[PDB]
Design a protein around this ligand. Structure first.
Ligand SMILES: [K+]
Lengths: 202, 202
């Protein structure tokens, strides 16, 4: 709610709109409560939200399903969709919460139409949610993996994706002045999250 | 050589000198070729360098051992020294190159005199050497662990260390102006490495 309207995810859809033409079908991978999915439908896209949590899915369906908004329960590492079913995909901080990010990335690739866009956000190095990874230093199992924005960037390129753009969502204390002097990796280092705009290679 | 005279490690000893009184004995944990150890002796400390590589140790002994400079081959997770043998310790990027950073940190604590200082540097998130960690995304074993500066900071505090100061060694494109507006974690995010000044709790 707050995240999408004025929070850390409030600039994602406008960025998405810069590349993905309206009416294109979009799959929201790891949609959670489905508010982002809802926002996509409100912007003019036919959106489908997928998440492993039955509770989350029911939560999204309560928003009102229609010809432009639907939700499906599913495993992110085994998406219940056909190859190239979606013209576009959005995956906001879903890849950090798996022990097998490459497996999940390959599924995103599979269901995305060749030459289609994939908008994927990855948490910055100091983003608070990453504190979940800390216990690994004591030998404990953790849910949030340590794949950084720049590591994901390279991984996507090695998996058949072209990175065409990207924007940061910066933490308090950062200004546009200091940014326009830093290489991309350092800009990503100062973020709460980085939003990549990828394209599945044709 | 270049690293210590004008490179990424050229501001470490001056920082060390701000806290550790001369003549104090210092152990250089993971001394490598021992140039840093040599520099410590040149600054006025009685330095001992320890490293697992027999080749590296012989390399350091070639610099000329004396009453203020010596080298010993040893396992960083099983230091061949007595409890509280050293009044001060320096560990420059040695903790990132082990699969068990906590084990190594506890050994550093053990050989350091209570209330003594430990100068420890940790690579920043985008430091090039961390590319060694990348293959883990393909399920491969890697030498460089992913423990970040801020994670180490918390780990040291939970292990009986007080963090009293710290300085960054920044990558090209960063200026002091933008820094004085960022919280410590973001300053660390923009570094090639962060140098912590710790004290073993009494
Ligand atoms: K890791």
């Amino acid at each position: 709610q707050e995240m999408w309207d004025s929070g850390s995810r409030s600039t994602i859809i406008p960025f998405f709109e810069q590349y993905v033409k309206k009416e294109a079908e979009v799959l929201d991978v790891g949609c959670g409560d489905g508010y982002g999915t809802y926002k996509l439908s409100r912007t003019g896209y036919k959106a489908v939200g997928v998440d492993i949590s039955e509770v989350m899915i029911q939560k999204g369906k309560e928003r009102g399903e229609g010809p432009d908004l639907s939700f499906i329960k599913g495993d992110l590492s085994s998406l219940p969709f056909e190859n190239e079913q979606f013209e576009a995909i959005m995956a906001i901080n879903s890849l950090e919460w798996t022990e097998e990010p490459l497996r999940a990335l390959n599924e995103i690739k599979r269901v995305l139409k060749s030459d289609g866009y994939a908008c994927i956000a990855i948490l910055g190095p100091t983003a608070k949610p990453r504190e979940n990874s800390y216990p690994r230093l004591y030998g404990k199992d953790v849910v949030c993996n340590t794949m950084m924005p720049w590591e994901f960037e390279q991984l996507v390129k090695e998996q058949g994706f072209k990175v065409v753009d990207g924007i940061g969502v910066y933490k308090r204390g950062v200004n546009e002045k200091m940014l326009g002097q830093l290489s991309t990796d350092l800009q990503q280092s100062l973020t709460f999250l980085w939003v990549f705009m990828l394209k599945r290679h044709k």
